[PDB]
């Protein structure tokens, strides 16, 4: 169970390092930066998808599972990367994207040709309604209908994501076998595990029932879009046929997951996955179900964060396993989203890191999180993401459920592209990401926020992350201790306790810009503490009462 003790670094490779000058990050670029990742201390890398793809969704629309997209390199480069990871004592996890393929995948190019094609039933085709409209009212995550009509055959195909991402038909045993063959091809060549993209969607309600509607919207995304009736059957089959034959790690991107679903995926006795990503803690700052979805912003609410993260810590405390993340290629920079990214940027970045890394589970560090990368001020016309383009058209232009100004404000907070501007290596041109022209501009603050300056500054966010990772490797309590929320009603302070074999770990973090007070509960007042990490310089170990400075974070271990 090395995956319980791991710290994972997520690379978004088109934006990590461009070794050959075309402005697009590449596999040889990753290889050249592996020493940096090892020095940080992560021991597992998760690479976002590098398989051949027309890039409609930046690699999540795969047109060939057994070849690389040419700008990343060739399979030879990928095999070298695997070897280079292993030579450093690290592991590599690839992105398994098997809810859907590109519409340019050979399977779909064949499927769409005719009802008698042998690939027809690789995808999900249905007749129009009598009036020619879509089979039901289901929506795409990327706006509009989940169905697209094919004039040549007279049927619609299903796509939960873009029209260039047709969903695979997992009811067809041949599709499942194709998926297992892909997994074995890569695992036999040294891939150590998989991050499984929208694994929650692979089983459909094959009666395709309409949702109920209150007429706020024409197309609906809801409970049928995940947790289908055969979901866990399929994952159990995948474990029997593939995962059980390798020393591997699996993490599912479990869209639609709540704590009970997480137990189904992650209880070891069920022989499914090791861990899942949930969205519940990322969902605290949207309204529950507006037509504008995640663009219907709410302010950061620490109480909501504490409630949600505590539900997950206690729910998987003695069964299953948690992932721990605040950032990925789909989320904004957490310090910009929920904190201070200006005068208190360092303290705030370190504070969020401490809250997260003090918990039970496997931490994930998204590229640039460890240097305090921030959201971008770029104008809307500079964004790339199809999610944004499609939502602008639907919400602002067509349906008018958001004004222009409100949509721009929402994108500046939550746009996926805040995660995707290039990694900031130094203060030179394009932050040292490329000698050419980057595929999207580097964030305008890069001259102040970059690896070079971080390694020169002993007070950097980088060295704080490096220390959190070292502590996890030294103190078994951080991996295996239980969890108890402390001072639960405090609106500024996120404090909790871990316990393991008579030892205690106290984590106290002021997630606010104002002064706060932590007082230990009565059962803890006679403990003696050794401070393991703090993001301010004043040092005292009487943690029973702490007058917390803005964004102050501290972890102590009992002695
Ligand atoms: Ca390149």
Swiss-Prot record:
Catalytic residues in the record: 197 (nucleophile), 253 (proton donor)
Broad class of enzyme this protein falls into: hydrolase
Substrates-to-products reaction catalysed: Hydrolysis of (1->6)-alpha-D-glucosidic linkages in some oligosaccharides produced from starch and glycogen by alpha-amylase, and in isomaltose
Molecular-function GO term, any one: oligo-1,6-glucosidase activity
Coiled-coil blocks: none
Annotated binding of Ca(2+), by residue: 18, 20, 22, 24, 26
Cellular component GO terms held in the UniProt record: cytoplasm
Cross-referenced InterPro entries: Glyco_hydro_13_cat_dom, Glyco_hydro_b, Glycoside_hydrolase_SF, Malt_amylase-like_C, O16G_dom_2
Family the entry assigns: Belongs to the glycosyl hydrolase 13 family.
NCBIfam families named in the record: PRK10933.1
Name this protein carries in UniProt: Oligo-1,6-glucosidase 1
Organism: Bacillus subtilis (strain 168)
Gene: malL
